[PDB]
Amino acid sequence: PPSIEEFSIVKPISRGKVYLGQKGGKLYAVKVVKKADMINKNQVQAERDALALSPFIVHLYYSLQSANNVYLVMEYLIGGDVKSLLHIYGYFDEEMAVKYISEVALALDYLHRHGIIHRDLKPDNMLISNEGHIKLTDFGLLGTPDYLAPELLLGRAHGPAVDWWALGVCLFEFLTGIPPFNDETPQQVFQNILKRDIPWPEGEEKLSDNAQSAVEILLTIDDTKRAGMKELKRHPLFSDVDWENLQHQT
Numbered sequence: 001p002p003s004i005e006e007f008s009i010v011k012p013i014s015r016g017k018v019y020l021g022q023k024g025g026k027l028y029a030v031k032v033v034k035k036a037d038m039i040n041k042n043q044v045q046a047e048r049d050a051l052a053l054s055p056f057i058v059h060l061y062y063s064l065q066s067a068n069n070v071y072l073v074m075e076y077l078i079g080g081d082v083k084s085l086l087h088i089y090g091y092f093d094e095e096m097a098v099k100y101i102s103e104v105a106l107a108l109d110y111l112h113r114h115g116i117i118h119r120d121l122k123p124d125n126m127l128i129s130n131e132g133h134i135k136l137t138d139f140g141l142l143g144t145p146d147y148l149a150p151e152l153l154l155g156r157a158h159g160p161a162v163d164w165w166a167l168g169v170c171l172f173e174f175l176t177g178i179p180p181f182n183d184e185t186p187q188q189v190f191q192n193i194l195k196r197d198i199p200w201p202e203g204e205e206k207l208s209d210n211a212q213s214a215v216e217i218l219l220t221i222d223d224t225k226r227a228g229m230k231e232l233k234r235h236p237l238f239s240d241v242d243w244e245n246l247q248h249q250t
C-alpha cells in the first residue's frame with residue numbers, strides 16, 4: 001500500500017487539477033480532487049471506477065487519499081493532449097483527423113462494450129499515448145457546453161449516442177480548428193446545438209463530401225437515428241481503415 005509522500009510534485013500539466021509526479025525515477029500524472037467538490041457538490045468514485053477498467057483508456061496505477069484531497073496516480077504521456085496538438089497545427093489534414101477519430105471511436109466502442117458512457121468526450125481529454133494512439137481521461141460518468149448532445153441539453157434520459165455526438169463535434173473541430181457550435185455566450189451555443197447550426201466552410205477550404213457526411217451522421221439531432229460504431233465503421237470516410245489491424249497496433 002504505497003503512500004503519497006513518495007510522490008514529488010514536479011510541475012502542473014492540467015487545470016480537479018493534474019500534476020506531473022515523480023517516484024523512484026518514474027513520472028506519474030496525479031489528479032488532485034479536494035473535498036471542496038468531492039464531499040460538497042457530489043460521482044467521484046465514478047471516474048476512479050471507469051479508469052480502473054484499460055488498453056485504449058489511460059492506465060490508473062494507484063488510488064490514494066489525503067486530509068482533504070483524493071489522488072489519481074495515472075500514467076504520464078509526454079505526447080500531451082489532442083487539444084494542444086491541434087492549437088499547434090491550427091487544424092489536422094483529412095487523413096490525420098480520420099486517424100485520430102477512428103482511434104477515439106475504438107476507445108468509445110471499448111467503453112460502451114463494457115457498459116460505460118464517457119459523457120465528457122473532447123480533445124482536451126484525448127491523450128496522445130507514447131505509442132501514438134489516443135487514450136481517454138477526465139471521466140464525467142453539466143460539462144463543456146460546446147460538445148454536449150441535444151438530449152444532454154434537454155435533460156433527457158440518454159445513452160451512448162451522446163458520445164457519438166461529441167465524436168462528431170471533434171471530427172469537425174479537427175478539420176477546422178474551431179468547434180462547429182461555437183459562440184460567445186453559453187446560451188448562444190445551446191441554440192446552435194439545437195438548431196444543428198454546422199458552419200460548413202466554402203472555397204478551397206470547403207470540407208470533403210465524405211467528411212461532411214461523416215460529421216452529419218454524428219451530429220444528428222434524433223438520437224434514435226444518430227450514427228454509432230456500426231454506421232461509422234461502414235461509412236465511406238473510414239474506408240481506408242483496417243479496424244482489425246488498428247485493434248492489434250495497440
Ligand SMILES: CCNc1cc2cc(-c3cncn3C)nc(N)c2cn1
Pocket residue numbers: 013014018029031058074075076077078079080081124125127137138139
Ligand atoms: C503533458 C500532458 N500529458 C498528460 C496529461 C494527462 C492528463 C490527465 C487528465 C486527467 N483528467 C483530465 N486530464 C487531461 N491524465 C493523465 N494521465 C495525463 C498524462 N499525461
